């Protein structure tokens, strides 16, 4: 009848990918199964996934896939009766969540060593546990909120002032300078965005992202690997720890 949302048409070139994209994903995984030998399965639970591109560029040799877990798992073949190769059903039962596949032609031990050595600093995702009581001084709020020494720190922008005020900082932009309390300083007390042990929420995570404060560690947890010749999957550490269905 009536009383419904006014659907906002999107005046933009990019469109839905859809059924064609999904069947393209089946085709890609199914055709890339045969060439490679070690199909690793890995997890990235609650880390931002910018650096997957960098690890792609590093392991240019290998081929990596990451989509719908269900889509990829059934492209592999969940049921053993409809299965591309023996043991791939085991790989499917490993595939549960924030999970990616890694076709490789080279040494699994070297793969494990490199992925153990892989480690990057990152801005924290929502839901994690904060390790520090990071705060901003009562004086002028700078670009990073005081993490680097203020003498070598540029002030943060009046453009970002409204966002900080919206996300909760009692900050005021006086004389063109954004400051928590008084322009000279003192006056106020301070603003602690997050505390030690506190479960970081979306608000605090956006605060760290705006103030360029990193408190998460991008690392990939290899659940397991399947060999083509043997046709079996060997779980390692994260494989047994991470629940699967």
């Amino acid at each position: 009848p009536k009383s419904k949302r006014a659907r906002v048409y999107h005046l933009i070139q990019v469109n839905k990918k859809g059924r064609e994209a999904k069947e393209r994903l089946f085709s890609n995984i199914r055709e890339t199964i045969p060439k490679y030998q070690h199909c690793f399965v890995f997890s990235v639970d609650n880390m931002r996934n910018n650096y997957l591109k960098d690890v792609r560029h590093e392991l240019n040799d290998c081929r990596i896939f990451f989509g719908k877990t269900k889509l990829m798992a059934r492209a592999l073949g969940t049921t053993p009766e409809e299965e591309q190769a023996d043991g791939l059903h085991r790989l499917t039962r490993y595939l549960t969540g924030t999970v990616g596949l890694l076709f490789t032609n080279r040494d699994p031990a070297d793969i494990e060593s490199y992925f153990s050595n892989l480690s990057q600093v990152d801005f924290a995702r929502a839901g994690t546990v904060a390790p520090r009581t990071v705060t901003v001084p009562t004086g002028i709020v700078y670009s990073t909120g005081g993490e680097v020494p203020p003498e070598h720190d540029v002030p943060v922008s009046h453009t970002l002032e409204p966002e900080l005020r919206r996300l909760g900082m009692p900050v005021r932009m006086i004389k063109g300078k954004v400051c928590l309390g008084d322009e000279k300083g003192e006056a106020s007390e301070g603003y602690t965005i997050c505390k030690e042990g506190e479960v970081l929420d979306s608000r605090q995570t956006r605060l760290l992202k705006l103030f360029s404060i990193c408190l998460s560690e991008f690392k990939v947890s290899l659940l397991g690997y399947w060999n083509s010749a043997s046709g079996e999957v060997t779980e390692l550490e994260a494989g047994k720890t991470r629940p699967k269905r």
């Binding site: 005020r165 909760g168 009692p170 005021r172 309390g181 006056a187 106020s188 007390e189």
Partner: protein
């Protein structure tokens, strides 16, 4: 289409006392008691499990199930008020004339009164009477900031809107004259 039946569920925590006699939802908690009459809508209340209240309509319309949804939300807000309570951190800004705010417990009627002076230099003193049950304090952590704490979300929000509306600029360019008292934070006491 005249839906035969529809239900919604409201979970209650372990530390409350909820009672609906006819339609007077009275919820009792650590901070106090909140009572609201819901006699204007047709709903059937029951206790569907140990700690979830089921509110239902039988032979009702889409408007009626919409009423069920909104009354569910109001009851949930009462539960939240009696468990955690509501806090409104209010901020005031000035350019050249510092605004003076004074809060006083008028003992008769037992109510807060907030007086605002030197708002853009007007000699008038804006006195606002405060909602019953909610408390006002001058925050010491931050400057030019007040705290409005209470149990009733409706009362605290209406009072904050009353302040933000009484402190309103007339016949001046809003782009230049930025003075006023504004809402900053809305959350729970805990």
């Amino acid at each position: 289409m005249r839906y035969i039946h529809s239900e919604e569920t409201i979970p209650v925590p372990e530390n409350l006392k909820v009672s609906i006699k006819s339609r007077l939802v009275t919820v009792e908690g650590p901070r106090g008691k909140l009572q609201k009459d819901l006699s204007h809508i047709a709903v059937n209340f029951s206790v569907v499990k140990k700690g979830v209240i089921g509110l239902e309509i039988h032979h009702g319309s889409r408007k009626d199930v919409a009423a069920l949804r909104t009354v569910r939300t109001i009851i949930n807000n009462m539960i939240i008020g009696v468990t955690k309570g509501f806090k409104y951190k209010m901020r005031y800004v000035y350019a050249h004339f510092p605004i003076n705010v004074n809060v006083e417990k008028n003992a008769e009627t037992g109510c807060y009164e907030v007086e605002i002076r030197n708002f853009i230099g007007e000699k008038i003193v804006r006195k606002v009477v405060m909602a019953p049950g909610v408390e006002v304090e001058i925050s010491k952590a931050q400057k030019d900031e007040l705290i409005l704490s209470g149990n009733s979300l409706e009362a605290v929000s209406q009072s904050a809107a009353d302040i933000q509306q009484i402190c309103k600029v007339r016949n001046k360019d809003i782009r230049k004259f930025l003075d006023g008292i504004y809402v900053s934070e809305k959350g729970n006491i805990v």
